C-alpha cells in the first residue's frame, strides 16, 4: 500500500476517473488518469487500476458510487487543502 496526496486545479478538478462501488459490486479502481492533471503528476503517482481503500481517512468498503464521489468533492475533509488517498496497486 502506497499513500498519495494531491490538490485540485483552479477549477477544483483532479483529472482521474473512477468506477465500482458497493452498488456496482466492484472495488473502487482508477479508470483513467488524464495526462497533465494533478493525479498524473503526483509522487507517488496515481495510475490506472490502483484500488483505493481510504479517502481523507475513511474506509469506503461498504459505500456506494455516488457516495464516494461525494466524498472526494467534499473540499473540507482536506487537511492543508490536499486530498489524501490510500491505494493498493
Amino acid at each position: 500500500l502506497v499513500l498519495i496526496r494531491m490538490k485540485p486545479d483552479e477549477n477544483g478538478r483532479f483529472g482521474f476517473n473512477v468506477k465500482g462501488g458497493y452498488d456496482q459490486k466492484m472495488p473502487v479502481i482508477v479508470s483513467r488518469v488524464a495526462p497533465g492533471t494533478p493525479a498524473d503528476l503526483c509522487v507517488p503517482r496515481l495510475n490506472e487500476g490502483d484500488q483505493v481503500v481510504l479517502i481523507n481517512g475513511r474506509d469506503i468498503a461498504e459505500h456506494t458510487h455516488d457516495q464516494v464521489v461525494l466524498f472526494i468533492k467534499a473540499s473540507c475533509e482536506r487537511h492543508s487543502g490536499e486530498l489524501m488517498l490510500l491505494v493498493r496497486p
Binding site: 478538478r13 483529472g15 482521474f16 476517473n17 473512477v18 468506477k19 456496482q24 458510487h65 464521489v69 468533492k73
Partner: peptide
Amino acid sequence: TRRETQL
C-alpha cells in the same frame, strides 16, 4: 452499463 465518473 456500469457507471464511471470523472473527478
